[PDB]
Design a binder for this molecule. Sequence first.
Ligand SMILES: Nc1nc2c(ncn2[C@H]2C[C@H](O)[C@@H](COP(=O)(O)OP(=O)(O)OP(=O)(O)O)O2)c(=O)[nH]1
Ligand SMILES: Nc1nc2c(ncn2[C@H]2C[C@H](O)[C@@H](COP(=O)(O)OP(=O)(O)OP(=O)(O)O)O2)c(=O)[nH]1
Ligand SMILES: Nc1nc2c(ncn2[C@H]2C[C@H](O)[C@@H](COP(=O)(O)OP(=O)(O)OP(=O)(O)O)O2)c(=O)[nH]1
Ligand SMILES: Nc1nc2c(ncn2[C@H]2C[C@H](O)[C@@H](COP(=O)(O)OP(=O)(O)OP(=O)(O)O)O2)c(=O)[nH]1
Lengths: 481, 481, 481, 481
Amino acid sequence: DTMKVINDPIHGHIELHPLLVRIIDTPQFQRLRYIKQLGGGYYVFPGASHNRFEHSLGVGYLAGCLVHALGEKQPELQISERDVLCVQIAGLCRNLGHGPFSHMFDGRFIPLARPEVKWTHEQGSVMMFEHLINSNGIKPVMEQYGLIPEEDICFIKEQIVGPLELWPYKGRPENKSFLYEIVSNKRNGIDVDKWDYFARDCHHLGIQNNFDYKRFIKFARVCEVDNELRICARDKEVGNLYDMFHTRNSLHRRAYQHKVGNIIDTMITDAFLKADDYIEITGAGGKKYRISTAIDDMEAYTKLTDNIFLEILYSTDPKLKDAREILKQIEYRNLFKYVGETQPTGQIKIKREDYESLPKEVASAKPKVLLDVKLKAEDFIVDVINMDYGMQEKNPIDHVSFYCKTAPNRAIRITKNQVSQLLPEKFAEQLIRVYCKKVDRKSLYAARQYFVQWCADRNFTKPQDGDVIAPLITPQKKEWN
Amino acid sequence: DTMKVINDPIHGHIELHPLLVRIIDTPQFQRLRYIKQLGGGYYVFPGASHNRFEHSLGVGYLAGCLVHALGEKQPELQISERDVLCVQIAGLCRNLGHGPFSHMFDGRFIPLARPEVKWTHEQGSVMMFEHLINSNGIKPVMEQYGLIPEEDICFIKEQIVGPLELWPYKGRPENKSFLYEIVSNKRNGIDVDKWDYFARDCHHLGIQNNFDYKRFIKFARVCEVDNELRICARDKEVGNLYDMFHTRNSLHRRAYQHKVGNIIDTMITDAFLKADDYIEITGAGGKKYRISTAIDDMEAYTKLTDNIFLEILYSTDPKLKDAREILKQIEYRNLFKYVGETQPTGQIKIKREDYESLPKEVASAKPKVLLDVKLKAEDFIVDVINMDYGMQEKNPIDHVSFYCKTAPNRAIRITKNQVSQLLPEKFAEQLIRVYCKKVDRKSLYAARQYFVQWCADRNFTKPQDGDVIAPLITPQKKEWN
Amino acid sequence: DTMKVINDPIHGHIELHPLLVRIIDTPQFQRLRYIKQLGGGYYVFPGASHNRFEHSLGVGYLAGCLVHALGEKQPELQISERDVLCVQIAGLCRNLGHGPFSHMFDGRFIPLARPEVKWTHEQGSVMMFEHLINSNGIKPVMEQYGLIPEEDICFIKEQIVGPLELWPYKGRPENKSFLYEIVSNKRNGIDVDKWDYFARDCHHLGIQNNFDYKRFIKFARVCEVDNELRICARDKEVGNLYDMFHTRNSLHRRAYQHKVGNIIDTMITDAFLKADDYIEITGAGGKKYRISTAIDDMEAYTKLTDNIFLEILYSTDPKLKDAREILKQIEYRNLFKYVGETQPTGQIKIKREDYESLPKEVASAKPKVLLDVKLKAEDFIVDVINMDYGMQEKNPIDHVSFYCKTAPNRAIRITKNQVSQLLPEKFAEQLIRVYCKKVDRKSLYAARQYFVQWCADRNFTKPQDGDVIAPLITPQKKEWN
Amino acid sequence: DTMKVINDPIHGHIELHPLLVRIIDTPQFQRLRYIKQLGGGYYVFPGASHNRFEHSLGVGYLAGCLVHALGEKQPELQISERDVLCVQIAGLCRNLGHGPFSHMFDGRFIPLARPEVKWTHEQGSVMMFEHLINSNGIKPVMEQYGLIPEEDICFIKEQIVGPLELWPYKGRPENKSFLYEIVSNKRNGIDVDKWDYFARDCHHLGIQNNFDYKRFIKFARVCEVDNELRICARDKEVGNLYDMFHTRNSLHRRAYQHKVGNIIDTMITDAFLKADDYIEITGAGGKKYRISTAIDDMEAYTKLTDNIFLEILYSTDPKLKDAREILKQIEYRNLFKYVGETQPTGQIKIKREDYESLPKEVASAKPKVLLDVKLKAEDFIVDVINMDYGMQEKNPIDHVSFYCKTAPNRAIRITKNQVSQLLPEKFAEQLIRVYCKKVDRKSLYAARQYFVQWCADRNFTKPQDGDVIAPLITPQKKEWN
Ligand SMILES: Nc1nc2c(ncn2[C@H]2C[C@H](O)[C@@H](COP(=O)(O)OP(=O)(O)OP(=O)(O)O)O2)c(=O)[nH]1
Ligand SMILES: Nc1nc2c(ncn2[C@H]2C[C@H](O)[C@@H](COP(=O)(O)OP(=O)(O)OP(=O)(O)O)O2)c(=O)[nH]1
Ligand SMILES: Nc1nc2c(ncn2[C@H]2C[C@H](O)[C@@H](COP(=O)(O)OP(=O)(O)OP(=O)(O)O)O2)c(=O)[nH]1
Ligand SMILES: Nc1nc2c(ncn2[C@H]2C[C@H](O)[C@@H](COP(=O)(O)OP(=O)(O)OP(=O)(O)O)O2)c(=O)[nH]1
């Protein structure tokens, strides 16, 4: 019937149009209440209990703010109430494809369980969306509020996942290209999804967010750029945009890639791999799926949430004993032990195809110290983390259009040297973390020696504590002294 | 083993002594990660995703702050490091006995499932604590850090639940009476547990907390009162104490007793009642328990969390169909419908023994109006809520001892009229909410006519929207205009 | 000329229309940068350095928010861009008449310096506004943006001060009556001025505000009430409105009437009285005024700010020696000493005409304790403070119109008993503070005996520390024992 | 005399020892209430009304936190209550030397008025401190609380200004070296002064601070480094330390060097230069000083505050007409106009001795565009701003000592490549801003052409809006295209 108000600690009072309420009040959407935003991060940062549900509300709210702000200041863009609703829906729905513990599922579990498939949460969001619509009779409701389902469903999916295949989009024409830059911005990654998570994650983690999305919204305008209408920021704000990506990188370094968070995600992934043959999830027509195959049936995937963790933990079946035991070690805080971190030097870049060979390389190192235990490849975990500004080696600010106060309809470019010499020289790097599955004192001492020796042999950077954890190894390396 | 630092969004960096870490890193404590602080409140306030776990860390931290502050200002009290740890442990552990959805479990479910038993979360905390200690070899660890288990375990339990029965306590002597006022203050309810939840619940709900616990700590002292050493507040702070209880009452009104939060707790309770025969929880020695009997075995209770909700929702067994269908209605937001609220007038006080008769009474009202449908007792839910300042009809500030700047060791009393005439004249009241299980438009119209007629017949207060929802009924009542 | 953005810590990014910018960029408006919001409160709460200038920006902003919100939800009201600008201007300009140290000037100094005149900051705001307009060529600028100066200048003044004398207003007709409720709400005091100062004063004082003005704005509507269009709140929000006035009262008790803040305001007022014959302020046509007569000439008043305080403090003229010495005692923190506080009982209400007799009464009390020193009337200060809900004895919520969800265009009333029995039974009271100008130990002891005896003789409430500060006096009073 | 509590919106309840209260309650300290922390920043960011007084309380509080934290963790350091108080005093007093509008006084005015003198606010703080102590009888009070004035006064001054002339300090010996790193850290700039102004300035400006000083305090330890006991940070925190300096730089870029804030500081400085021959400030024995010579007499300098601004503005003396007129233009917002910003390229570094030649260079540029007006050197202002990490070209993190969890007493170093490749390559740069004193449309157009042509001639970076403001000039430069 009518609009609803929701109170959110980040944004305050969010108004929801009744079509949005109908999308929200479904099993496919409400499911997001049972998926933690930060996965294993809650086990390090106890405030991070938030789930994808409330993040999705915030993304939909902000998407609506930005589109409304553009419309109000530039009526000549002809943004319709239909446009506004479609953008809010895409915003609400771009997290629907997340799986248990969020990035651990698409980032660790599925790549190990189903190495042959190419799955992303984005693709999952489109499939869940289609399933949500079809299972809940949403198309008639959309027509009731003036949407045109064929066009608008296409538009919504395109906002989430990009072109479903010269202007490549079918949901809207080039004169509305700027609409595609709101929810998931494939050109430079500046979108309302980051703005909600910066604010929400900081609130919960107890870390402070430096980025002012409202200021940015106020200074945003649409300008013509190479025969597209694109969103442009005020020239002055270029520093704040660099700062936005800097904040993204700090949040990754301190929280999202926390070394213990990551190892908890890894352990949970391992328990899931060991339980995968025994857990059954009933999908369409009563067919049974596994944790690794629920992504093939949306009805099964609907029922795949963080509950899988507790189902395993609370199980009594002897078949689940191995999985259950890994989870029990998490509760007792008997975790795989962090050994250290290093980075490649020079132009060395570690390729994905080499990842599996790394633990073997570490166990093959020949440190000169007397060791009571010997460790094997299987005792080591090597995590390779690609840290960047969202576009691999590229500077995303080279893909942003700006305008000046004296000519607000004229788009310009601003280069790095026009801003500051104190900015980063590079935009991507790799971090390598090593952990040991043997947690006793002697094994850990040994693991350290192998680790630092491997760093030396590969010409990686000297670990920060290298001289303390491996004082007999670090003197060999001239470049470190 | 050394101290750990945890970052909490409410309190910042909390330091945890290694004994505390050992208590925390157990299944019995980690269980609290899977129990929402506010139960069905998350279904109204989407920021309220927090669980009892992080609340318990905060209660333990604040307990430590208060005891440390007292010791530092008054060395003559002889507060030992042992005392400090025992108070931190009680603080950490006073939420261990909570069940699924927190107050819904002890407040709605158990009273209906096991009407013959007298269960409280406090009692449950003592039992889970004992089980935690015993199952994890904590006593030797306590001795390692200078605790004396026999005395100190007793002291901890007493802080949580009160005397395990003229000085009634055995864990500490009258010399240390003030220590019993920190974690769970039976005398007037001013304790660190409230202070954490005020700040934490407000952070998550998106409502602002007006109470300054750090100011109160700074102004607190121990003074002799009737041959006990008790905590006294500075005279000046009496207004801020009344404001504390006022804030508690606002939080209940706006959030904890939100009409839709309460109906969701009621629907979930109903699903639990319908599933209770079929859900099995394995406890000690492989014995099986139900949701309603897990409270009799701590090993089973350890595994009784919010996960029960999803286990039901995801079930395929036809035996669980009824329970599962209620939960499905929650997801679709097809909830029982709020009809209205009223209060008794005069000295009328509704007794617990009469609660069951109320839906009958409503259905027996004879509104003088044309009705398409007739409703029966079973179509109505009547919720009676007792709102007070924590001590029934009493003013808790009558039970607080104060001191003056001119004589800091002399305790005094301050009465209501010494403070302000703008304070409440009563400290307890009752609210009556009525809901209808028939949700269609005609049933709801009818429910409104019965409801308002019943209010008129009983001489209850006029519902705020009475003239709008029942314009043909409200004219009959002279007292209402 | 285009819009400007200002960043405010309370409201974020505030957009200012160019007409508003022109009003702001005048000596009459910028003057507010040199008048502390809380006067002598900065000398107790060191974060309270804020001035009337930034408060005025915030009031203008919120005035705009509320009027825009109403227009967007109810287009049928025909709120024009002209209406919006007039309301923003009134909001911006309702503080223009404040004098040095804000309420100290109109509340203490002018009543003692010019007892024959009836001066308010509201009257001063109208005069300064007229002077601002005329001195800066604003009328042509107003016309340029579609305002009609004769009607609209009237309207703005009426919003600030009320009718400049059946519909009593000339700036707008009855169908726009709701516009008069925004900036300065004479009917019940619920206006945007309070909302900005609650948030701003809390931010600076270091106290937390619990009123959510944004929620209130979202729930506000215009409805017909007795043939006027008035602003109505949603029924549900009635609790929050009581809480609003409760917050106002707490802020007055903790901050705005802090006993030391008030004594500093008194000492400053005293210095101003002693300097008044000697300070010259040049006004229109070179005429000279005094501090007490600058209110008669807006050109002189433009130059009358907190700077008077420093002019006196830094003076070398022997004529200002007495004034300067009082200010020097403030810097050394040699302040008059607080003796205690009490309240009248029963029907007793202390009239303004009796205020001067009260120190005489205190010095006339006859304690019957042995005293080293005797004190005279001139050694005592007695401060009488009227605390209420903004309408003397009346409940302002009786003057608020509400609507219900089922009939949003139908206004209703809600009485106290329809809300809660835990609300105040009275809405006004008086506090009496007593201070001694003799600050030595023996004088202060004596002052305490006189004070408490005077309380006993007048049947005032027992001071909270009475038994400690005057143990030989309090036993005499049966009613206190 | 007992402790006082002050409530601060940044830190909460700060306890002040009575010796500190005595230092605070003097004309020399209370003077800081009348000096804005951010000077002309209040004229851009209206929330920035805060003064140096409340900043100084915060620096003293944090200095006490850090020293107390070190003592509690490491009793073997033998930090005494005497050490604690001396560090709190130095913290309280390190802002005493600030002049009107803070950095504008020492940063713009004194360098132009007294080019021969080398004045810093640091030197001024030492002088004011000595004068504060002597004028107010503080030495006996210090002895009363166990301080030893000769040693401890030396120690305090050394903390503020560095060695008053191998261990160069006399106030404390090398085993207490770490105490010198708290208030003003000459080695790397990581001190409690930054930490307070980050949090306080952000709170007031409406920008969010992302540095967590409390976390840093908790991780700090004293370790031996080259036969000194120095403060060491945990290795892990190195990222956060880089982020701290990054935050400092953002605050300078967005706020402290705001182009309009700076121009206001310049205009005020200009008014002060024009008033300097006519304003009189009475110092010791009735002698008169000027604004530029008050720094030579502490009794005069005590009375030199932001009041000087209003004294000029409110003056009637025809000798002050020129000064008064500049201030009046500030009120009307007729400010000098910003033309643009650029930076040097390559190894070009602009020296202080060249600053005065720059406007001449700009006016000598030869654009070869048709110009209606010609501009002269005196029409241009050129502001050169040095932005760095506090140590000119150096990386301050190269001057930080760290420790590892496995060996907490063993200090180590961490290099930039051990941390991240996404860090800055350089640590100092210069910004050049140009403004025009002729504010009309034709002058401003011309100014732009000269500016951009000058950039091209000097091989400076292309202004961001260069192509829009000077489309005929920017094509000439190949390097820009
Ligand atoms: N800040 C704040 N939030 C509130 C308060 N009361 C409820 N909420 C939150 C919970 C929800 O997220 C949102 C809306 O709840 P309401 O109680 O207004 O809506 P509800 O649908 O129960 O009422 P309605 O259908 O309009 O009668 O506001 C309040 O007093 N303050
Ligand atoms: N505020 C804040 N909290 C952090 C940051 N890094 C981690 N935390 C949180 C996560 C935890 O709740 C707590 C301690 O985490 P740490 O990373 O310091 O401890 P962890 O045990 O991983 O390191 P350690 O064993 O000392 O090497 O602080 C940070 O950069 N800022
Ligand atoms: N939150 C935030 N506020 C800022 C920042 N930069 C400036 N402000 C504040 C200062 C003012 O209150 C307001 C507008 O400042 P701007 O620098 O955008 O306006 P200005 O008139 O100087 O620039 P313009 O005339 O548009 O070139 O925003 C920023 O980076 N973050
Ligand atoms: N947060 C908070 N701050 C307060 C309150 N009352 C006063 N303050 C602030 C003002 C000052 O910065 C500081 C100390 O104020 P007090 O009223 O406790 O000190 P005062 O010296 O007036 O009392 P005393 O001499 O001890 O009777 O706390 C309050 O209720 N809450």
